[PDB]
């Protein structure tokens, strides 16, 4: 019996995806040498196994390349040699993923996994498949798309604190549809911090912060006036500013219109892309606890706003109840938890 050479590609193959290493195997013999070069002749790095039976590329393979594999096998039954040439994927387009939250970070119990792509994803299912979420302790979750470029992942309920989350975005080599392929892989790992949930009740006009179930702060607040009310629902804490200029046009309301505004404020914590912040409002302290007067934000006293900035982190939860507003859109950017689990779990990959 002569040595037999088997590869994970075949001679003449086209559209070989490069999301996987290329391998050669010997049977009834051992591999004497294996090489793989591109058209230019540039070698691809490989590795033979100690027992001489298996060889595998150890380097990333390129898009739009023709590769040539040469292998020799020897055995008691004589020798064997194959030459294979194959052609890899040639994308029409490349898309790059950006993953949040940031790596190593510790975040609140409402933080979703987010993958944003710089281009429109025609085959959402393929993108979902290439994204591998690991959770410790394990918990079940699901993918949902807020728009054509960004997919989110989260459990049915708020994370239990102390949970490790690993996000492996392995889109390199993956067809995301209409000839779009991943430009790269990205990998983030984060931990879930303390449970922090702040409830804003319009009936009482108090924002109450609860850390691991204990009340630790009680803030009189002035929310949005009836003409421009604060939406009820769940808000996820986003970014935090010592000071910031709030510009109504950044959220699609012309500064120059009636509900327009441009305000320089202190100690602001964004809780929706739609432009809701908890921020310091000295100008309404007499209204806080009593009357709604804002364009939508949660007005608090300077010292309470700064307290919020210092003790609330990305991913903590703010819940608004009993306002005259509607509900905060689930596809807001920070309003993911307002979408019913059955609807979220069903996803929208198609």
Author numbering: 58 to 407
What does the paper say about this structure?
The final step of PG biosynthesis in Mtb is catalyzed by two different classes of enzymes, namely the D,D-transpeptidases (also known as Penicillin Binding Proteins – PBPs) and L,D-transpeptidases (Ldts). Approximately two-thirds of the linkages in Mtb PG are of 3 → 3 type and their synthesis is catalyzed by the Ldts, highlighting the importance of these non-classical transpeptidases to this pathogen.
All crystal forms belong to the monoclinic P21 space group with similar cell dimensions and contain two molecules per asymmetric unit. The RMSDs are 0.4 and 0.3 Å between apo-LdtMt2 and LdtMt2-biapenem or LdtMt2-tebipenem, respectively, and 0.17 Å between the holo structures for the same 702 aligned Cα atoms aligned. Interestingly, the electron densities in these complexes are similar in size and shape. The observed densities are larger than the glycerol molecule observed in the apo-LdtMt2 crystal form but smaller than expected for an intact biapenem or tebipenem adduct as illustrated in Fig. 1d. The glycerol molecule found in the apo-LdtMt2 crystal form is disconnected at 2.7 Å from the catalytic cysteine and poorly overlapping with the larger and connected MTOA adduct.
